[PDB]
Amino acid sequence: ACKDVFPAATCRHAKSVGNCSSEKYKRNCAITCGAC
């Protein structure tokens, strides 16, 4: 049970660079960062 709260535009931006470690863009965009 999860869903990306943050906008895809930002999410991808974090992943691209590899800032997935940061919680700021992990709790919301779980589908992207968490990969659930």
> Helix/strand/pairing class, anyone?
mainly alpha
| Number of discrete helical segments | 1
N-end to C-end Cα span: 8 Å
Strand content: under 5%
Give a quick account of the main beta sheet: strands, pairing sense, barrel closure: none
Helix content: 25-40%
Query: Helix-strand pattern, N to C?
Result: H
The radius of gyration computed from the alpha-carbon positions, rounded to a whole number of angstroms, is: 8 Å
Q: How would the global form be characterised?
A: globular
Strand elements, count: 0
Domain count:
1
PDB class: toxin
Keywords: OspTx2a, cysteine-rich peptide, NMR spectroscopy, structure, isomers, KV channel, toxin
Assembly: monomeric
Entry title: Structure of a new ShKT peptide from the sea anemone Oulactis sp: OspTx2a-p2
Description:
It contains 1 helix and no strands. It has one domain (1-36). It has one helix spanning 8-17. It is 28% helix and 0% strand. It is classed as toxin. The entry lists the keywords OspTx2a, cysteine-rich peptide, NMR spectroscopy, structure, isomers, KV channel, toxin. The assembly is monomeric.
